[PDB]
From a paper:
The majority of SSBs adopt homotetrameric configurations for activity.
The crystal structure of glycerol-bound SaSsbA was successfully determined at a resolution of 1.8 Å. In contrast to the crystal structure of apo-SaSsbA, this structure displayed two additional amino acid residues, namely P105 and K106, as indicated by the blue mesh, solely in the subunit A of SaSsbA. Within this structure of an SaSsbA dimer, two glycerol molecules (designated as Glycerol 1 and Glycerol 2) were present. However, these glycerol molecules exhibited distinct binding patterns to SaSsbA (see below). In light of the interactions identified through PLIP, it was established that the main chains of R80 and V92, along with the side chains of S79 and T93, partook in hydrogen bonding with Glycerol 1. Specifically, M1 (Subunit A), L2 (Subunit A), N3 (Subunit A), R4 (Subunit A), T36 (Subunit B), F37 (Subunit B), R76 (Subunit A), and D98 (Subunit A) were observed to participate within contact distance (<4 Å) in binding interactions with Glycerol 2. The structural evaluation conducted via PLIP underscored that the main chains of M1, N3, and T36, as well as the side chain of R76, were pivotal components in the hydrogen bonding network, fostering the binding of Glycerol 2.
Numbering used by the authors:
A (entry chain A), D (entry chain A): 1 to 37, 45 to 106
B (entry chain B), C (entry chain B): 1 to 39, 43 to 104
Write the structure that this text describes.
């Protein structure tokens, strides 16, 4: 079934590396995406070596584009509370501000 | 900037439909969207919200298991629950919902 | 940069299906996509192309009038026709096609 | 039915104004959109006063984002040849390079 999300926004902080529960390495970052009418704060996840591009080319405040799909998941946090999240899993990340 | 979501999936339950005392219709539903990649195929469960005439239409025509398309924007919001914990919410706010069955 | 198209519509004709002598499957079809805005409602007619296993699937399951979803990219190309005129082509190259019926 | 296209690219030339066959005024421009693997050249159309934003903020080479729908149409050109086109009709245009 169809599942596509496209965003352009600015990173709220420097990107990071994490490993998924299965031991898969990813890059993560949060985009502040301005509305056309205020902003939304969207957590993005990048698999494969694109994670290295993300962690080297992007920093806090960088403009980035993402083309990906929405994925849901949940987990129990440190305090023992179940957190439910919806994240953008990136098919590609575009570095719109190279200089 | 840019913020666009397009999904096709099936509602997990009958939509929930209410009218604020101000008169704005609101409908919510969760879209189950099967993945194309083959884990064994899993699904994602996306919480959707729609307003006004689109919400009226959703209530009149969609139910549990209905196939639907949504065209919308990803929105985040924050709230404090009754236990005092800050809860972060991500939802798709639908500009339109298409009835595919 | 970014280039993403998502459509849901009905095929105007049976897909056309061929295999290059190199062995790559190719399917083409035109998607009729009804407009949401009310002119009297009109439709847009988008030429789609798909390759490899997706093309095989399109040939096996889709026909004239079938409801389908496409997830893809807009591509432009140029050609000279037999009368010597340069023809500009815009097509959707499909990353996947979903069968909605 | 669903019909959505999202692009980021650079204008190939300065934007223009045109009026449709029914006398409706629009802005037009062409985006060069790089591929992730070369570019595609996509004609965009903007209705309403957003046409004025487009013709003042964007110029040749400007980075722009568009969120819109694909529309088909055809017409007979000057030489009397029927031309078939598919254009992006913009719900919004994002001016990604303000400075």
């Amino acid at each position: 079934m169809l599942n596509r999300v496209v965003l352009v926004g600015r990173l709220t902080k420097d990107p990071e590396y994490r490993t998924t529960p299965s031991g898969v390495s990813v890059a993560t970052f949060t985009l502040a995406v301005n509305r056309t009418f205020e902003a939304d704060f969207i957590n993005c996840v990048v698999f494969r070596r694109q994670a290295d591009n993300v962690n080297n080319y992007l920093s806090k405040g960088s403009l980035a584009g993402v083309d990906g799909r929405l994925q849901s998941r949940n987990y129990e946090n440190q305090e023992g509370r179940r957190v439910f999240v919806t994240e953008v899993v990136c098919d590609s990340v575009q570095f719109l501000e190279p200089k």
